Each structure stands twice: as structure tokens, then as C-alpha cells.
């Protein structure tokens, strides 16, 4: 939604461009658009959803 997806190899994170500030990748700091086939150089990682544990509680 803002910034860049980045990885240290072991993890995936998102940060704004102008200062490193790794955050978990979520339904809040991302938006969907379409199926994966179209995007050049796309990757697989689990996008988290903050509502999920609350529905589980």
C-alpha cells in the first residue's frame, strides 16, 4: 500500500523507501489486484490478516 516488499532471505517485510522499518506483510498494509499469472517476478509468501485471531476469539 506504501513502500517496498523486501527480504533478508529468511523473512519477508514491507518498508517505506526513504528509511528501513521492517513491518509484517498484511491485509492492512497491502491491497489485492487480480490473479498472480500477469506480474513479472512475483513471489510466494503468507500475507497475514489481523482480523483472523479475533474471529478465532
Amino acid at each position: 500500500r506504501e513502500g517496498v516488499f523486501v527480504s533478508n532471505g529468511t523473512h519477508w517485510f514491507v518498508t517505506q523507501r526513504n528509511f528501513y522499518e521492517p513491518q509484517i506483510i498484511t491485509t492492512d498494509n497491502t491491497f489485492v489486484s487480480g490473479n498472480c499469472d500477469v506480474v513479472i517476478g512475483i513471489v510466494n509468501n503468507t500475507v497475514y490478516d489481523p482480523l483472523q485471531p479475533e474471529l478465532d476469539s
Binding site: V4, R17, F31, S33, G34, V38, V39, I40, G41
Partner: protein
Amino acid sequence: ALQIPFAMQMAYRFNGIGVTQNVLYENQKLIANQFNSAIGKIQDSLSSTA
């Protein structure tokens, strides 16, 4: 200078004009063909029109 993949640089140029960056990645081949064709037309313009 910070290296960045060129497609992602174009994505942040697109957010700079309010076009949402998914519009680039969903059209990247089309945009590359347009850009390469447009540079080609400059060579014909300069070659024909001193």
C-alpha cells in the same frame, strides 16, 4: 545512488502521477513495447527533420 529494479522504479513514477502501481505491473510488456517504439520514432524524426 541506491540500486532498484527498473520495473519498480517505473512503479514509483506511476504512483507519482496518481496511477496505482498495479496498473504498471499488469501492463508491463505493453508499456515496454510503447516506450521502445517511442524511442524508435525519435531516430526517424531526427534522421528526416534536421
